[PDB]
Design a protein around this ligand. Structure first.
Ligand SMILES: C#Cc1cccc(Nc2ncnc3cc(OCCOC)c(OCCOC)cc23)c1
Length: 278
C-alpha cells in the first residue's frame, strides 16, 4: 500500500542524482531502519494540487510488476518527496557506459525483453509512462532491470498542453513526433521511446541525435532521419528499432509483440548482436 510519511520518518544521506525538477537521494526509512531512494521535487515544480498528486501517488503505488518500480511512500508538504526501494547497481545508462568491454549479447537482449514486459504491464493497466529512457531504467541485478519514474511526467504536468514550465526540459529526443507537435501521449508513443531506449543500450549509452539542438528534431524527423544502425546491431534488430519510429502510431509494433520478437532473439544472442570478445 501507499504509506503517508512525516519528515521525521526518513533521512536523506547522499545525493545520487540531480535534475531540473528535483534531486534523488540515498537515504533511510524508519517505519527498524531500511535503505531507500528518495526523489525530492523542488517546490512549485508541479502544476497539480495536493489532492491530485495524492491520487496519482496511489496509482504509482498500485503498480505491481517485477520490471517496474513501485512507490512505497510519499511525503507531502510544500515539496513532494517520493520513496522507492534502493537499487544496489543503479541506473542502466551509467552501467552500460562503465561496462562496455564486459557486456555480452545475452544481457542486452534480456534487458530489452524486460523493459517491454514492464511497458506491456503498464499498457494492460491503461497507464502511459510518458518518459521512457535509459536514465529511467534501474538495475536490480545485471539479469534484472526495472522501469522507474512512472507517473512523474504526469506530476510534472507533461500531459497538460497549456502548461509551459520554466527551466523545465522536455525529453524531445525521446518523443514521438505527435508528442513533439501535439503533445499527444499514447501507448504507441511510448513504443517510440522504447525504440530510442534500445538504441541507447546498443550504442552503450551514446547520446541520441548528438550535436543536433532540440529545436530541430521534429523537422529532421519529418525529413525521415532516424538514429543510425548501431555498430553491434544486425539489421534484424535494427528493423525492430526502426519500426518503432513510424509516423503512423498504429503501425508501430505493440509491446506485446516486442516481447515475443526480442525473446526469440535472446535465445540465439550471437546471431543478432556482434560484440568482440563474447
Ligand atoms: C523515489 C524515487 C526515484 C525516482 C526515479 C529515479 C530514482 N533513482 C533510483 N532509485 C532507486 N535506487 C537507485 C539506486 C542508484 O544507485 C545506487 C548505487 O549504484 C551506482 C541510483 O543511482 C543514480 C544514478 O547512478 C548510477 C538511482 C536509484 C528514484
Amino acid at each position: 500500500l501507499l504509506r503517508i510519511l512525516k519528515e521525521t520518518e526518513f533521512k536523506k544521506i547522499k545525493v545520487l542524482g540531480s535534475g531540473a525538477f528535483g534531486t534523488v537521494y540515498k537515504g533511510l526509512w524508519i517505519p527498524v531502519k531500511i535503505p531507500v531512494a528518495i526523489k525530492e521535487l523542488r517546490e512549485a515544480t508541479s502544476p497539480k494540487a495536493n489532492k491530485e498528486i495524492l491520487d496519482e501517488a496511489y496509482v504509482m503505488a498500485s503498480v505491481d510488476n517485477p520490471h517496474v518500480c513501485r512507490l512505497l511512500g510519499i511525503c507531502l508538504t510544500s515539496t513532494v518527496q517520493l520513496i522507492t526501494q534502493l537499487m544496489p547497481f543503479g541506473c542502466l545508462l551509467d552501467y552500460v557506459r562503465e561496462h562496455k568491454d564486459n557486456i555480452g549479447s545475452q544481457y542486452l537482449l534480456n534487458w530489452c525483453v524486460q523493459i517491454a514486459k514492464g511497458m506491456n504491464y503498464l499498457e494492460d493497466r491503461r497507464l502511459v509512462h510518458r518518459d521512457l529512457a535509459a536514465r529511467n531504467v534501474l538495475v536490480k541485478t545485471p539479469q534484472h532491470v526495472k522501469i522507474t519514474d512512472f507517473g512523474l511526467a504526469k506530476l510534472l504536468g507533461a500531459e497538460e498542453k497549456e502548461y509551459h514550465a520554466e527551466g523545465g526540459k522536455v525529453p524531445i529526443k525521446w518523443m514521438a513526433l505527435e508528442s513533439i507537435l501535439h503533445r499527444i501521449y499514447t501507448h504507441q508513443s511510448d513504443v517510440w521511446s522504447y525504440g530510442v531506449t534500445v538504441w541507447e543500450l546498443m550504442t552503450f549509452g551514446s547520446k541520441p541525435y548528438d550535436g543536433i539542438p532540440a529545436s530541430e528534431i521534429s523537422s529532421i524527423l519529418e525529413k525521415g532521419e532516424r538514429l543510425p544502425q548501431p555498430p553491434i546491431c544486425t539489421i534484424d534488430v535494427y528493423m525492430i528499432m526502426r519500426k518503432c519510429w513510424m509516423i503512423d502510431a498504429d503501425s508501430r509494433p505493440k509491446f506485446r509483440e516486442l516481447i515475443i520478437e526480442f525473446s526469440k532473439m535472446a535465445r540465439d544472442p550471437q546471431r543478432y548482436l556482434v560484440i568482440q570478445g563474447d
